Amino acid sequence: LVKPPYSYIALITMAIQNAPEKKITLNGIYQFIMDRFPFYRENKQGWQNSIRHNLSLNECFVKVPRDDKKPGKGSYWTLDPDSYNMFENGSFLRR
Amino acid sequence: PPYSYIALITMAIQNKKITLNGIYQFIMDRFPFYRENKQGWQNSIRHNLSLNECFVKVPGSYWTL
DNA sequence: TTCGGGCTGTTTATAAACAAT
DNA sequence: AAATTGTTTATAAACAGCCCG
């Protein structure tokens, strides 16, 4: 029960996966993760870096802009449908 | 040398298909920094080929841009 | 022929500079 | 400014496929 055996990609995926509109704000990602996995309630300085790194880097995650600017300071993220259901397994162990 | 690995791999291919060890060589042949040692930065060269869509493996296979 | 180690690749994790908003 | 959010390179490592001695 030290670290959840998920990648950041896994985590971001199930985060987007778990939105009702299937779009989520970066801080919404941070939250979903900490809300559920106690490991990431500390230190959070660093692993939040690597979450942002995985959005920027990975073609599977699609930044779409905010709506009505409420409040703003960050676009929404989604999944390239080519990669929605990439973690077909369901337990997010492989992609 | 103030070049990235991507820079280095690029000018390697630039110099137009090359084998991974051919990359290693072009780099060491020219930049003494990457002569000693050479156990880690070769890792990151391979990492940059796998990772970056700009590099195209055609059939160690050859690499291109 | 099996074993167990070296290269190819590929994928992740972490840390950092650095720009955009 | 002043922080968050994004983009981009690094550096190391976990983990396959091999070809090979």
Curated annotation (Swiss-Prot), chain A:
It is linked to Lymphedema-distichiasis syndrome: An autosomal dominant disorder characterized by primary limb lymphedema associated with distichiasis (double rows of eyelashes, with extra eyelashes growing from the Meibomian gland orifices). Swelling of the extremities, due to altered lymphatic flow, usually appears in late childhood or puberty. Most affected individuals have ocular findings including corneal irritation, recurrent conjunctivitis, and photophobia. Drooping of the upper eyelid (ptosis) is a variable feature of the lymphedema-distichiasis syndrome, occurring in about 30% of patients. This is Forkhead box protein C2. It is found in: Nucleus. Phosphorylation regulates FOXC2 transcriptional activity by promoting its recruitment to chromatin. Transcriptional activator. Residues 2-93 bind DNA. The gene is FOXC2.
